[PDB]
Design an enzyme around this catalytic site. Structure first.
Site, PDB file in Angstrom:
ATOM      1  N   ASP A 180     -53.319  25.130 -21.960  1.00 38.88           N
ATOM      2  CA  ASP A 180     -53.196  23.668 -21.897  1.00 38.88           C
ATOM      3  C   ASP A 180     -51.822  23.148 -22.295  1.00 38.88           C
ATOM      4  OD1 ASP A 180     -53.420  20.746 -22.400  1.00 38.88           O
ATOM      5  OD2 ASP A 180     -55.554  20.969 -22.157  1.00 38.88           O
ATOM      6  N   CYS A 214     -53.215  19.308 -13.626  1.00 37.33           N
ATOM      7  CA  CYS A 214     -53.781  20.143 -14.680  1.00 37.33           C
ATOM      8  C   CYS A 214     -54.956  19.382 -15.290  1.00 37.33           C
ATOM      9  CB  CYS A 214     -52.737  20.536 -15.727  1.00 37.33           C
ATOM     10  SG  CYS A 214     -51.567  19.240 -16.159  1.00 37.33           S
ATOM     11  N   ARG A 220     -48.282  20.810 -17.556  1.00 36.22           N
ATOM     12  CA  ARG A 220     -48.077  21.937 -16.648  1.00 36.22           C
ATOM     13  C   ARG A 220     -47.664  21.464 -15.263  1.00 36.22           C
ATOM     14  NH1 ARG A 220     -53.791  24.641 -18.416  1.00 36.22           N
ATOM     15  NH2 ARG A 220     -54.226  22.437 -18.843  1.00 36.22           N
ATOM     16  N   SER A 221     -48.231  20.331 -14.853  1.00 37.80           N
ATOM     17  CA  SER A 221     -47.922  19.697 -13.576  1.00 37.80           C
ATOM     18  C   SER A 221     -46.456  19.297 -13.482  1.00 37.80           C
ATOM     19  CB  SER A 221     -48.825  18.488 -13.366  1.00 37.80           C
ATOM     20  OG  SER A 221     -50.174  18.914 -13.224  1.00 37.80           O
ATOM     21  N   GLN A 261     -44.958  18.395 -21.598  1.00 39.41           N
ATOM     22  CA  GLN A 261     -45.546  17.929 -22.855  1.00 39.41           C
ATOM     23  C   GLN A 261     -45.007  18.567 -24.124  1.00 39.41           C
ATOM     24  OE1 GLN A 261     -46.965  15.505 -23.854  1.00 39.41           O
ATOM     25  NE2 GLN A 261     -48.624  14.708 -22.598  1.00 39.41           N
TER      26      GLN A 261
END
EC number: 3.1.3.48
Length: 296
Positions: A180, A214, A220-221, A261
């Site tokens: 994540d 994601c 992650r995107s 992130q």
């Protein structure tokens, strides 16, 4: 250039500081449509919302809202749609967007269950026999075939507009080993996955923008899209020195909030582009070297 920048940040150990510099500088735009009480149950995370100027609108009269943003990279001449992992009620909305935006590919960088929590709804059929029907959006989705590799899965899906009986082949690229708030195991495995998406044509201009998601569709995107864009920019100029990754990320952050992130994700972004440059700069054999190193 992107490596002197890399080594300079690494030997000092200031990835977090370099990243805050991005967090401080990122654009801030109104998300007034996303925040309306009637769209409360259409958002996975309250604090992850599409801006009003770059949000995708569903082509329906009732409610055109979906937590998705169109990232338009003008110089790179590539567009991505970044969305959250569909909720149980927004699965029809998701495929409506796919149909309406005329997308060829769907890139999934998360698992349905991660760290023991549900991060995304099962929005595509797992078995050829049991196809899915989305009554709210009048759409059919059938699994045609899947190719399960060790760390990713490509699926061929058939989307059918139940209204017009029109059919479209959707490709589903499912990265299964990307945590994540984490990074891929290697630049080797990530790029191999990216270039597989590239090879399908799903990113090509003859199709609508690719749908990348994601759980929230920013971490992650954002990593996937940043790396893709940079490499594409590097390819267009054949000048690796000319691309400023931080500037590309800030450019992207104009279209959707919180892209990438963690500071480690940014570190990976550099790593992925530096390594991928090899293939861009005229070394074709590294493409097969990534495939050997990923153990797919």
């Amino acid at each position: 250039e992107m490596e002197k920048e890399f080594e300079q940040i690494d030997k000092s150990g200031s990835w977090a500081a370099i990243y805050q510099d991005i967090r401080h500088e990122a654009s801030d735009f109104p998300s007034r449509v996303a925040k309306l009480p009637k769209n409360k149950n259409r958002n996975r995370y309250c604090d992850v919302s599409p801006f009003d100027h770059s949000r995708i609108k569903l082509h329906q009269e009732d409610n055109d809202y979906i937590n998705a943003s169109l990232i338009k990279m003008e110089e790179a001449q590539r567009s991505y749609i970044l969305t959250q992992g569909p909720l149980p009620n927004t699965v029809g909305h998701f495929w409506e967007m796919v149909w309406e935006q005329k997308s060829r590919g769907v890139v999934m960088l998360n698992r349905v269950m991660e760290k023991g929590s549900l991060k995304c709804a099962q929005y595509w059929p797992q078995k050829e026999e049991k196809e899915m029907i989305f009554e709210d959006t009048n759409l059919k989705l059938t699994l045609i075939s899947e190719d399960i590799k060790s760390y990713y899965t490509v699926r061929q899906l058939e989307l059918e507009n139940l209204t017009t009986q029109e059919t479209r082949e959707i490709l589903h690229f499912h990265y299964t080993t990307w945590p994540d708030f984490g990074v891929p195991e290697s630049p080797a495995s990530f790029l191999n996955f990216l270039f597989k998406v590239r090879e399908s044509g799903s990113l090509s201009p003859e199709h609508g923008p690719v749908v990348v998601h994601c759980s929230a569709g920013i971490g992650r995107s954002g990593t996937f899209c940043l790396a893709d864009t940079c490499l594409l920019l590097m390819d267009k100029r054949k000048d690796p020195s000319s691309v400023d990754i931080k500037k590309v990320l800030l450019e992207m952050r104009k279209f959707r909030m919180g892209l990438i992130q963690t500071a480690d994700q940014l570190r990976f972004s550099y790593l992925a582009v530096i390594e991928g440059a090899k293939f861009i700069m005229g070394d074709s054999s590294v493409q097969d070297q990534w495939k050997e190193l990923s153990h797919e």
